[PDB]
C-alpha cells in the first residue's frame, strides 16, 4: 500500500544524491520504485512534489527533535544548551544533504517549498527568541538588541552556513568546524554586554 | 559607442525594478535602449549576459568602496570600525536592490555568476579575518575561533540577512534594524571572551 509511496520516496532521495531533480524523470522514479509511470501518478502530481514530501519529512524531522530537547532539559552550561539545538540541525540535514541541497534550490520556483520553509524557518526563531527572553528573565543575558531580531539574524546565518558547508560550496566553513563556530557567535551574541 | 551599452545596461536595471529576468526579453532592452534586436546582440550574447554585467559592476563598487575605507581608517572606536565596513555593503547593495536580488537567482543557473559570487566572497572573508587578526595582534580581540572560520560564518550571515531583508522575505529582519543587527554580531563575536 503506503509502501510503495515509500518506495517513491526513498528513490527520490537516492536519485538526488548523484543528480539534481531537473536530471531525474517520472521514469527513473516509478523505475526505482518497481511500478509504473502512471501508478505513479496516483501518489504524486509531479516528482516536484516528492520532493517536497521529501523535505517536508526532514523539517518535521528536525522540528520534533527540537521540541524533544525542548521538553527535555540536558543539565549543563548555557553554551552546552545552545550548541545541543543547533546540533539538531546540523545532524538532521547533514543527515540529508541531497533533500536539503534540492529543497534550497525549490525555494525559487515552488510556492509550496518557499512557504514550507518559511513557515519553520518563524517556528524557529520564535523559539530562539523565547529561550533569549527566558535567559533575559532569569539575569543571564543582558538586554541589547531586540531578541526577535537578533534570534532571525542567527537563524538565517545557520541556514546559509550549515548549507555552505554541506555543500562544500566555496567559501564555507569546514563542515568538521562549522558546528563550534555557529555556537560561538551564538553564544557571544546572546550573552555579551560588549 | 558605449552609450549604446550603457542604455542597454540601464534599461536592463530598470526593467528587473518590475520583474525578473526571465520575464524580460531582448526585445524589452533593445526596445528600452532605442535599438534593434540584432544591434543588442553585437553589444551583448543574452540577456543573462547584460545581468552577469550588473552584478559585477555592483560587486566592483561595494569592493572599491571597501578599498578606500581600508586605506582611509575612520577615526573612531572599534564598534564603528566594524559598522563603517558593514555599512558599504548595506548601502552599495541596498541602493541596488534589484541587480542584487536578479544575480541572488543567477548563482542556480549560471557558472560565472556563481563563480563571480565566489571570488568577491573570498576577498571579502580574507580582508574580515585580516582585519581579526590585526585586532588580536594588538590585545584588542580575544584568540577565540580560527580568524578565518569566524570570517567565513560573519560574511554568510551579511551575505543571508541583508538580501533577506531587502526583498522583505519572511522571516527577515527590518530593514531600518538590519545594520545594527549585524554589527551587534560582530562586535560581540569577534571581542567576546564568552
Ligand atoms: F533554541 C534554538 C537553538 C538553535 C536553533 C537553530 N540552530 N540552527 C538553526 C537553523 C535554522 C534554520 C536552518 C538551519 C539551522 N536553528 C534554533 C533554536
Ligand atoms: F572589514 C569588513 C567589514 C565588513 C564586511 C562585510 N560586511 N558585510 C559583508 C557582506 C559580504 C557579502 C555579502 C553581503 C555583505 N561583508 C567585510 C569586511
Known sequence: ???????????????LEDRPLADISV???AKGAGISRPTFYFYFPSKEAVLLTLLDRVVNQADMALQTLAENPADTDRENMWRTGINVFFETFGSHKAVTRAGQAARATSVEVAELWS????KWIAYTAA??????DRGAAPRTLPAHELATAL???NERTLFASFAGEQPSVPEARVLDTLVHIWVT??????
Open 119 to 122: 513557515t519553520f524557518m518563524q
Open 189 to 194: 551574541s546572546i550573552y555579551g554586554e560588549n
Open 155 to 157: 537563524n538565517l546565518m
Open 27 to 29: 521514469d527513473d522514479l
Open 1 to 15: 500500500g503506503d509502501d510503495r509511496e515509500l518506495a517513491i520516496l526513498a528513490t527520490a532521495e537516492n536519485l
Open 131 to 136: 529561550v533569549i527572553d527566558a535567559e533575559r
